[PDB]
Amino acid sequence: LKFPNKIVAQVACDVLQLLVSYWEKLQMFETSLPRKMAEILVATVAFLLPSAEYSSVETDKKFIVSLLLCLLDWCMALPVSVLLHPVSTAVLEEQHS
Amino acid sequence: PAQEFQTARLFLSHFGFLSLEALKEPANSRLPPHLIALDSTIPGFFDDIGYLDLLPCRPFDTVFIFYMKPGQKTNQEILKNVESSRTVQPHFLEFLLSLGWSVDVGRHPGWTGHVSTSWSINCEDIGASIFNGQKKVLYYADALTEIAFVVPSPVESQGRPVPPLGPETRVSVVWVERYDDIENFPLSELMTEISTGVETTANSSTTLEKEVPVIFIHPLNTGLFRIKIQGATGKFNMVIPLVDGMIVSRRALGFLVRQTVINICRRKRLESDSYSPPHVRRKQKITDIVNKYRNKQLEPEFYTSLFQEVGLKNCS
Amino acid sequence: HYPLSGGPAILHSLVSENHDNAHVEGSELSFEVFRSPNLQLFVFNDSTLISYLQTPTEGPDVRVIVRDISGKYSWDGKVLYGPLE
Amino acid sequence: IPLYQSFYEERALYLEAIIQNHREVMTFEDFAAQVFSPSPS
Amino acid sequence: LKLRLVNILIGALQTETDPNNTQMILGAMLNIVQDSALLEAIGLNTDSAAGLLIRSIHLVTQRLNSQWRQDMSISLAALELLSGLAKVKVMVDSGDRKRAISSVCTYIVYQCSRPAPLHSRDLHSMIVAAFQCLCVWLTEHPDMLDEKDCLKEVLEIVELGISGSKSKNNEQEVKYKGDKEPNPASMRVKDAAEATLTCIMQLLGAFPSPSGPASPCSLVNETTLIKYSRLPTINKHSFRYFVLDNSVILAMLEQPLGNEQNDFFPSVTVLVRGMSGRLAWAQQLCLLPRGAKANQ
Amino acid sequence: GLGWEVDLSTHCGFMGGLQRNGSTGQTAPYYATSTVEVIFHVSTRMPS
Amino acid sequence: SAMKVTSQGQPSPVEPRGPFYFCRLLLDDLGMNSWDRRKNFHLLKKNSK
């Protein structure tokens, strides 16, 4: 997703958008997998944000828009109860917050 | 199809109240943002909600009615003559029933002349002592005024936290049979017998005698009535609807008495310097509630509050 | 809330000012709808159109129709004067 | 296709154009009169 | 002798200059007008109730706009008399009532235009009393506000009371809403004007609510809704309280009460507690119009 | 497998040039999501 | 009946007279008429366009 080239990134984003149709199978395989996909999308769009809008290249903005739309699709497909489950990651769990 | 519905977020978003600009903290100011979420877990929230509920939206007054017989100077006898039946002129009862309708104190949703049994939203001859304030009370209400007429009777054998309303206004009406007994009226001795319960509130009996004015009704032998009013002169002279030494027929007696009571109470409220309209009191109470119960959250922290379920806070 | 009772084919309410208007008997929008003496349009936060319309009293009212960038929605509301139960 | 705009962008632009064109500036007296009675009196 | 009495009373009112005498005369006029009106209702036209009321209103308004401006007690007496005459239930031409409200509004304009050194607490008290009298006149006769001129004058007076200056000016540039600085004469005048606006917007017309004349606010609260829902899940914490613009407090319940048969659609129970008073609501979300409510 | 069938007579969604009279067909597959709506012009459903 | 006075009676509820009463009540019950709202709130000219 965070590849320097944008065409391969766009193809990867489309492939991720494809997986939304099999979220039931992903849940049956591993419980936390769809939440992991949503976290991956959130982190990627956060990382690409600082150098996206403060630039004169439209391709980065278009890729950001595509990332946001895929995130919206993933959120809509998932139920509300799953989205409210806390994020379980080592770096943040080390902190007392 | 979906089953559950969190309609609150739909309502906030559809009307345009919920937005990033609305939730943004004001710059260089202390007023809260345009949208604020309160808390139902901080102790005393429901008590303050009840405080806000008990505040009325329109001014209210109180009127006491007494009956006098010749050769009476003690408060006990004056209170006693009322509670008897068939021992007074029928014109007194006719004048009473022309002041307002009758409403039970328990089922009355408005002012009833006594704090402890007022604003209760949760629903053989005895004479004019029924209206003593324990079973029934004469009531009148308009779009801008509310009056509770109560006739005191002899006394025989924190749960309602009300914020200070302001200077209570009450006017007494006395039915005298002989004009010479007007001066011999024990107004001082009956101050303790006409406590409305607002004395504990209204914090913002000798000194209260001058505050209350008195209206005297003296029937004549020709059917007309003679009126004398004491202690109703202030900065703006006297009140017009019933001047001193006036004569009024029985047709326009109750209406003129009610108008005089309204004008006197309005003048008394306007004269005092520690009085504000009830909507100002409600606005100040709302501002105090906002200051003491607002939730300090950022914009992203507030959207996620809508999706989280409520009602299980004390159960989970 | 996406799978509403009307099926996934319908997402935003299809109602408008012409519907349930006593002063206009037509089923399509027309200038007579604006000629109604009980219709008014407002702009809120410079990014929302709010339409207030007092329908004839159906019983078990105020009708609010809102148009924004997310679509259009309709609200039917009535006051509760008397006590309950 | 050149200058192709998504649905939400077109809807937002059209809504902004409508608001800008049809917005009415008036004194508070006229606004309160209109709120009190939509048709003139 | 009734005609002679009325004529001499009118002459005494016209020729009087002392304050106390004028107050007594005004009280007598109110008494006689009310008595004649009630007698006619229960049963040169100067003896007639309608003509007597018209003449009384005309004389009082003329005196108020002519001489009773530099005096406080006399002006307050005239305001109380004009407030008293509203309660009289006698058919009369709307022109007289329009003239009365026009005179009251002109008095408001004159008093609020006094120089700053002459301003005092008594002036603001008189302004508040006149606002209350105007509110009583509007409430007792909601019909006459259908006129363009009466409504325009009333709203101009309210705007002058709130903002401190009328939006329209004879020669000065006009001002619009939003870009007008708030410069009220005083806090009391501003509060009175706001109360008048709230009354004319909500209480004007249909004063007795189905809840009863005793309580203008709705007689339903959180406890009533909880005990009426008859659902163990609903508790005192099920509500979500919101504050709008630091003035309005909401209390929203996200459970249908069964009032609407559309159990398949969202329902909310807004419970507004504003500065005017408590008021309930029941909003519903509908996707299809009334033509196919039962066809879904 | 490309979507459920919708009766064109009483369909309130996207049309894509189809007609209510039934000349262009009576049924057609339909697949729509929270943000994407797709309708197929199947050639084996339109009478010829 | 001239010397007879009518006893006061409780007034009965009366339906609102205006054709825009409920919408106006809803507008003024949400604070839309407060001083602060007089900036980000306006009207729309009603015409064919």
mmCIF file with all atom_site columns, C-alpha atoms in Angstrom, chain B residues 89-190:
data_model
loop_
_atom_site.group_PDB
_atom_site.id
_atom_site.type_symbol
_atom_site.label_atom_id
_atom_site.label_alt_id
_atom_site.label_comp_id
_atom_site.label_asym_id
_atom_site.label_entity_id
_atom_site.label_seq_id
_atom_site.pdbx_PDB_ins_code
_atom_site.Cartn_x
_atom_site.Cartn_y
_atom_site.Cartn_z
_atom_site.occupancy
_atom_site.B_iso_or_equiv
_atom_site.pdbx_formal_charge
_atom_site.auth_seq_id
_atom_site.auth_comp_id
_atom_site.auth_asym_id
_atom_site.auth_atom_id
_atom_site.pdbx_PDB_model_num
ATOM 1   C CA . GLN B 1 89  ? -73.648 36.696 54.457 1.00 0.00 ? 89  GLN B CA 1
ATOM 2   C CA . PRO B 1 90  ? -74.356 34.763 51.232 1.00 0.00 ? 90  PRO B CA 1
ATOM 3   C CA . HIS B 1 91  ? -72.807 37.653 49.304 1.00 0.00 ? 91  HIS B CA 1
ATOM 4   C CA . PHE B 1 92  ? -69.423 36.634 50.721 1.00 0.00 ? 92  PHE B CA 1
ATOM 5   C CA . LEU B 1 93  ? -69.763 33.177 49.169 1.00 0.00 ? 93  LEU B CA 1
ATOM 6   C CA . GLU B 1 94  ? -70.988 34.700 45.903 1.00 0.00 ? 94  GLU B CA 1
ATOM 7   C CA . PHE B 1 95  ? -67.944 36.990 45.826 1.00 0.00 ? 95  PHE B CA 1
ATOM 8   C CA . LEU B 1 96  ? -65.685 34.023 46.613 1.00 0.00 ? 96  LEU B CA 1
ATOM 9   C CA . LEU B 1 97  ? -66.986 31.872 43.763 1.00 0.00 ? 97  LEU B CA 1
ATOM 10  C CA . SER B 1 98  ? -66.495 34.761 41.305 1.00 0.00 ? 98  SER B CA 1
ATOM 11  C CA . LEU B 1 99  ? -62.698 34.846 41.766 1.00 0.00 ? 99  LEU B CA 1
ATOM 12  C CA . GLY B 1 100 ? -61.676 31.565 40.135 1.00 0.00 ? 100 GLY B CA 1
ATOM 13  C CA . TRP B 1 101 ? -62.369 27.883 39.719 1.00 0.00 ? 101 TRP B CA 1
ATOM 14  C CA . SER B 1 102 ? -61.710 25.136 42.273 1.00 0.00 ? 102 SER B CA 1
ATOM 15  C CA . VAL B 1 103 ? -58.817 22.682 41.919 1.00 0.00 ? 103 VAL B CA 1
ATOM 16  C CA . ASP B 1 104 ? -57.654 19.974 44.307 1.00 0.00 ? 104 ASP B CA 1
ATOM 17  C CA . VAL B 1 105 ? -54.262 20.627 45.879 1.00 0.00 ? 105 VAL B CA 1
ATOM 18  C CA . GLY B 1 106 ? -52.988 17.107 45.209 1.00 0.00 ? 106 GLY B CA 1
ATOM 19  C CA . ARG B 1 107 ? -53.817 17.089 41.493 1.00 0.00 ? 107 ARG B CA 1
ATOM 20  C CA . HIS B 1 108 ? -52.864 20.718 40.831 1.00 0.00 ? 108 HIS B CA 1
ATOM 21  C CA . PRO B 1 109 ? -49.871 20.967 38.449 1.00 0.00 ? 109 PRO B CA 1
ATOM 22  C CA . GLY B 1 110 ? -49.270 24.639 39.274 1.00 0.00 ? 110 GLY B CA 1
ATOM 23  C CA . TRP B 1 111 ? -48.927 27.070 42.165 1.00 0.00 ? 111 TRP B CA 1
ATOM 24  C CA . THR B 1 112 ? -51.339 26.426 45.030 1.00 0.00 ? 112 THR B CA 1
ATOM 25  C CA . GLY B 1 113 ? -50.185 28.988 47.603 1.00 0.00 ? 113 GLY B CA 1
ATOM 26  C CA . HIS B 1 114 ? -47.828 26.672 49.500 1.00 0.00 ? 114 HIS B CA 1
ATOM 27  C CA . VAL B 1 115 ? -44.505 25.273 48.331 1.00 0.00 ? 115 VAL B CA 1
ATOM 28  C CA . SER B 1 116 ? -44.724 21.800 49.857 1.00 0.00 ? 116 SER B CA 1
ATOM 29  C CA . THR B 1 117 ? -47.854 20.815 47.912 1.00 0.00 ? 117 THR B CA 1
ATOM 30  C CA . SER B 1 118 ? -47.325 22.667 44.632 1.00 0.00 ? 118 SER B CA 1
ATOM 31  C CA . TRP B 1 119 ? -46.120 21.707 41.154 1.00 0.00 ? 119 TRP B CA 1
ATOM 32  C CA . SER B 1 120 ? -47.133 18.076 41.727 1.00 0.00 ? 120 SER B CA 1
ATOM 33  C CA . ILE B 1 121 ? -47.199 16.798 38.147 1.00 0.00 ? 121 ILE B CA 1
ATOM 34  C CA . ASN B 1 122 ? -47.851 13.246 39.395 1.00 0.00 ? 122 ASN B CA 1
ATOM 35  C CA . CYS B 1 123 ? -51.631 12.914 39.666 1.00 0.00 ? 123 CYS B CA 1
ATOM 36  C CA . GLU B 1 124 ? -73.128 18.178 56.042 1.00 0.00 ? 124 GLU B CA 1
ATOM 37  C CA . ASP B 1 125 ? -71.875 21.735 55.510 1.00 0.00 ? 125 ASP B CA 1
ATOM 38  C CA . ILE B 1 126 ? -68.325 22.984 56.046 1.00 0.00 ? 126 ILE B CA 1
ATOM 39  C CA . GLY B 1 127 ? -68.446 26.441 54.451 1.00 0.00 ? 127 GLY B CA 1
ATOM 40  C CA . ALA B 1 128 ? -65.551 28.398 52.988 1.00 0.00 ? 128 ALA B CA 1
ATOM 41  C CA . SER B 1 129 ? -63.005 26.437 55.047 1.00 0.00 ? 129 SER B CA 1
ATOM 42  C CA . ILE B 1 130 ? -62.570 23.882 52.245 1.00 0.00 ? 130 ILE B CA 1
ATOM 43  C CA . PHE B 1 131 ? -60.329 26.444 50.528 1.00 0.00 ? 131 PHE B CA 1
ATOM 44  C CA . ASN B 1 132 ? -57.928 26.592 53.493 1.00 0.00 ? 132 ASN B CA 1
ATOM 45  C CA . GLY B 1 133 ? -55.146 25.057 51.378 1.00 0.00 ? 133 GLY B CA 1
ATOM 46  C CA . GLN B 1 134 ? -55.225 21.377 52.382 1.00 0.00 ? 134 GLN B CA 1
ATOM 47  C CA . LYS B 1 135 ? -57.989 20.001 50.147 1.00 0.00 ? 135 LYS B CA 1
ATOM 48  C CA . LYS B 1 136 ? -58.971 22.719 47.653 1.00 0.00 ? 136 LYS B CA 1
ATOM 49  C CA . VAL B 1 137 ? -57.702 26.149 46.601 1.00 0.00 ? 137 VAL B CA 1
ATOM 50  C CA . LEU B 1 138 ? -59.274 28.851 44.449 1.00 0.00 ? 138 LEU B CA 1
ATOM 51  C CA . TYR B 1 139 ? -57.113 29.287 41.369 1.00 0.00 ? 139 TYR B CA 1
ATOM 52  C CA . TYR B 1 140 ? -56.836 31.657 38.423 1.00 0.00 ? 140 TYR B CA 1
ATOM 53  C CA . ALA B 1 141 ? -54.438 31.526 35.493 1.00 0.00 ? 141 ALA B CA 1
ATOM 54  C CA . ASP B 1 142 ? -53.855 33.634 32.399 1.00 0.00 ? 142 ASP B CA 1
ATOM 55  C CA . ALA B 1 143 ? -51.118 33.654 29.761 1.00 0.00 ? 143 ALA B CA 1
ATOM 56  C CA . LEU B 1 144 ? -49.033 36.030 31.900 1.00 0.00 ? 144 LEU B CA 1
ATOM 57  C CA . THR B 1 145 ? -50.332 35.745 35.487 1.00 0.00 ? 145 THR B CA 1
ATOM 58  C CA . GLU B 1 146 ? -51.169 33.047 38.022 1.00 0.00 ? 146 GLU B CA 1
ATOM 59  C CA . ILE B 1 147 ? -52.994 33.692 41.304 1.00 0.00 ? 147 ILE B CA 1
ATOM 60  C CA . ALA B 1 148 ? -53.923 31.271 44.090 1.00 0.00 ? 148 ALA B CA 1
ATOM 61  C CA . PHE B 1 149 ? -56.731 32.453 46.377 1.00 0.00 ? 149 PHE B CA 1
ATOM 62  C CA . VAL B 1 150 ? -56.638 30.677 49.749 1.00 0.00 ? 150 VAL B CA 1
ATOM 63  C CA . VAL B 1 151 ? -58.861 31.370 52.770 1.00 0.00 ? 151 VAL B CA 1
ATOM 64  C CA . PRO B 1 152 ? -57.000 30.661 56.045 1.00 0.00 ? 152 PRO B CA 1
ATOM 65  C CA . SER B 1 153 ? -58.745 28.489 58.626 1.00 0.00 ? 153 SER B CA 1
ATOM 66  C CA . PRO B 1 154 ? -57.986 27.628 62.263 1.00 0.00 ? 154 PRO B CA 1
ATOM 67  C CA . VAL B 1 155 ? -55.383 24.927 62.840 1.00 0.00 ? 155 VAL B CA 1
ATOM 68  C CA . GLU B 1 156 ? -56.804 21.838 64.549 1.00 0.00 ? 156 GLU B CA 1
ATOM 69  C CA . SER B 1 157 ? -55.682 18.231 64.895 1.00 0.00 ? 157 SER B CA 1
ATOM 70  C CA . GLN B 1 158 ? -35.096 19.283 51.478 1.00 0.00 ? 158 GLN B CA 1
ATOM 71  C CA . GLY B 1 159 ? -37.442 16.749 49.899 1.00 0.00 ? 159 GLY B CA 1
ATOM 72  C CA . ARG B 1 160 ? -38.732 19.516 47.603 1.00 0.00 ? 160 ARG B CA 1
ATOM 73  C CA . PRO B 1 161 ? -35.594 21.553 46.865 1.00 0.00 ? 161 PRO B CA 1
ATOM 74  C CA . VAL B 1 162 ? -36.765 24.836 45.331 1.00 0.00 ? 162 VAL B CA 1
ATOM 75  C CA . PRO B 1 163 ? -34.213 27.527 44.384 1.00 0.00 ? 163 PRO B CA 1
ATOM 76  C CA . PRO B 1 164 ? -34.886 31.065 45.653 1.00 0.00 ? 164 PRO B CA 1
ATOM 77  C CA . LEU B 1 165 ? -37.561 32.560 43.406 1.00 0.00 ? 165 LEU B CA 1
ATOM 78  C CA . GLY B 1 166 ? -37.317 36.132 44.664 1.00 0.00 ? 166 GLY B CA 1
ATOM 79  C CA . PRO B 1 167 ? -39.376 38.626 46.661 1.00 0.00 ? 167 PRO B CA 1
ATOM 80  C CA . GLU B 1 168 ? -42.725 36.973 47.336 1.00 0.00 ? 168 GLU B CA 1
ATOM 81  C CA . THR B 1 169 ? -45.766 39.196 46.803 1.00 0.00 ? 169 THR B CA 1
ATOM 82  C CA . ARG B 1 170 ? -48.997 38.574 48.705 1.00 0.00 ? 170 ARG B CA 1
ATOM 83  C CA . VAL B 1 171 ? -52.100 40.726 49.193 1.00 0.00 ? 171 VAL B CA 1
ATOM 84  C CA . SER B 1 172 ? -54.827 40.213 51.798 1.00 0.00 ? 172 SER B CA 1
ATOM 85  C CA . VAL B 1 173 ? -58.552 40.791 51.241 1.00 0.00 ? 173 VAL B CA 1
ATOM 86  C CA . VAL B 1 174 ? -60.738 41.405 54.298 1.00 0.00 ? 174 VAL B CA 1
ATOM 87  C CA . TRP B 1 175 ? -64.547 41.319 54.364 1.00 0.00 ? 175 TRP B CA 1
ATOM 88  C CA . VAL B 1 176 ? -65.616 43.709 57.139 1.00 0.00 ? 176 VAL B CA 1
ATOM 89  C CA . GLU B 1 177 ? -69.249 43.985 58.207 1.00 0.00 ? 177 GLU B CA 1
ATOM 90  C CA . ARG B 1 178 ? -68.860 47.221 60.209 1.00 0.00 ? 178 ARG B CA 1
ATOM 91  C CA . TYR B 1 179 ? -66.727 50.051 58.850 1.00 0.00 ? 179 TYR B CA 1
ATOM 92  C CA . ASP B 1 180 ? -65.541 51.117 62.312 1.00 0.00 ? 180 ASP B CA 1
ATOM 93  C CA . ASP B 1 181 ? -63.678 47.809 62.769 1.00 0.00 ? 181 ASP B CA 1
ATOM 94  C CA . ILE B 1 182 ? -61.350 48.463 59.812 1.00 0.00 ? 182 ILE B CA 1
ATOM 95  C CA . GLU B 1 183 ? -58.761 50.198 61.991 1.00 0.00 ? 183 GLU B CA 1
ATOM 96  C CA . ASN B 1 184 ? -59.032 47.419 64.605 1.00 0.00 ? 184 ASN B CA 1
ATOM 97  C CA . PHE B 1 185 ? -57.643 44.676 62.373 1.00 0.00 ? 185 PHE B CA 1
ATOM 98  C CA . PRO B 1 186 ? -54.915 42.484 63.966 1.00 0.00 ? 186 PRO B CA 1
ATOM 99  C CA . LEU B 1 187 ? -52.767 42.235 60.848 1.00 0.00 ? 187 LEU B CA 1
ATOM 100 C CA . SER B 1 188 ? -49.585 41.713 62.879 1.00 0.00 ? 188 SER B CA 1
ATOM 101 C CA . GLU B 1 189 ? -50.906 38.744 64.871 1.00 0.00 ? 189 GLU B CA 1
ATOM 102 C CA . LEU B 1 190 ? -51.794 36.773 61.716 1.00 0.00 ? 190 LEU B CA 1
#
